[PDB]
Amino acid sequence: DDVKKIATVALAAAYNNGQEINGFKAGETIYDIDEDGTITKKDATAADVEADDFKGLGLKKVVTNLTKTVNENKQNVDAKVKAAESEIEKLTTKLADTDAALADTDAALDATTNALNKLGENITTFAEETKTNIVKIDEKLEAASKH
Amino acid sequence: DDVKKIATVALAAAYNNGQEINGFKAGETIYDIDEDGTITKKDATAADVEADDFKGLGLKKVVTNLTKTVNENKQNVDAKVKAAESEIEKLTTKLADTDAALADTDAALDATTNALNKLGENITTFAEETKTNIVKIDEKLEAASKH
Amino acid sequence: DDVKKIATVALAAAYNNGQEINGFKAGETIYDIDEDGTITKKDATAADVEADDFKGLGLKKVVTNLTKTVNENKQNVDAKVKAAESEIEKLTTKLADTDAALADTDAALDATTNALNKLGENITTFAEETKTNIVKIDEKLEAASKH
Ligand SMILES: [Cl-]
């Protein structure tokens, strides 16, 4: 009957859809429905298994695994980014400590420069006063000589 | 008939596959096809729902949600990495500003050191010439005493 | 017969499930099973295709593509994080080089300051001994005048 054929094709089609959802292994029964509604009972080979989009795992297993991958890949990258930010936080503190130390060096350099200028000025006055005193003495001697 | 059985199994198999694709809820009709081709009409419990890979959501819903997760997880991490790179860019500018300021401190220190050394050489000369003059005066006095 | 109906619904149901797994295009035969078990043979429009969860791609194609997306998104972010860490490593070395240079500036400044201080103490001794010698000469002259 025609109803025998429709029922046979439907069962084999339902079977094959089930294997796409729940997977298949090497040796497991697989049906090939020919364009003329012909059912061919075949036992899947290592070829059919290895050369399948999901390699006989089925949509459920693949989606369960992909969900695991997505979740692990987020945990993995979040830890890497938290590690990078930790490194950035330490560099920031060390750069602020360097700038604070540089500001103090600059303060100490200004004090040494000003003490230098003040010393230079004080030596000049003493040199001028000393010159004036030695010149005066020389004059008192040059005058006391000629008599 | 045997065709009655094949058609019944095919419908129930097609039905279940549909529920794996489109999902099921607590109370919704579920068929269990026994290894002897026996169909058992039941009503999915809260147990069947809670203890299912996708918890009665179906492959379509789960894949639509997983696509949302993948896309949001990329937007979330791209913003975190753009934030980290923004910090790195600010640290680079500040570190280049510190190095430029350190180079100027070094230049300022060199000039203070040169000014100090020049002053040191100038005072030594002055000190020497002063010693010479005072020594000469003392001699003119030590000689003028001897009479 | 009732078995004719069950077989025709099963085939159409198995057919649609297959299209949900393997996809459908505009023009491709689609069956709509009415709640009264009525099969309606139609042709999928551009509307049915554009307004479908996966736009007629099917669960297999969508899951294969999503797997590609997940994998590329990890390669893309791992390279961005390796790039950020590369910058962090170069900032660390440059900050350690700045701190080493700042420590040497401090050492050089400490030495200029101590040389300034020693010089300052040496001129004070010289100035004091010079004042004394001049005061003595002035006394020998102030006394030798009084006769
Ligand atoms: Cl099916």
Author numbering:
A (entry chain B), B (entry chain C), C (entry chain A): 28 to 174
Report text from the authors:
Next, we performed structural studies to verify the organization of the most highly stabilized mutant; we crystallized and determined the structure of the NadA3 24–170 A33I I38L double mutant. The structure was refined to a resolution of 2.65 Å, with final Rwork and Rfree values of 20% and 24%. Upon superposition, the mutant structure was confirmed to be essentially identical to that of the native protein, even in the relatively flexible wings, exhibiting a root mean square deviation (RMSD) of 0.23 Å for the pairwise superposition of 144 Cα atoms. The halide in the stabilized mutant presented a lower B factor than in the wild type (44.6 Å2 versus 69.7 Å2), which likely reflects a higher overall stability in the mutant, which has a lower overall B factor than the wild type (66.0 Å2 versus 88.3 Å2). However, some mutations abolished binding to LOX-1; these were A33I, A33I I38L, and Y42A. While the presence of the bulky Ile side chain at position 33 in NadA4 and NadA5 may confer greater thermostability, it may also cause the functional closure of this intermonomer pocket, resulting in the observed loss of binding to LOX-1.
Neisserial adhesin A (NadA) is one of the main vaccine antigens, acts in host cell adhesion, and may influence colonization and invasion. NadA belongs to the OCA (oligomeric coiled-coil adhesin) family, a subgroup of the trimeric autotransporter adhesins (TAA), which generally mediate adhesion of Gram-negative bacteria to target cells or to the extracellular matrix and invasion. The structure of NadA3 24–170 presents a small globular head region (residues 24 to 85) and a long trimeric coiled-coil motif made of canonical heptad repeats, plus the two novel undecad repeats.
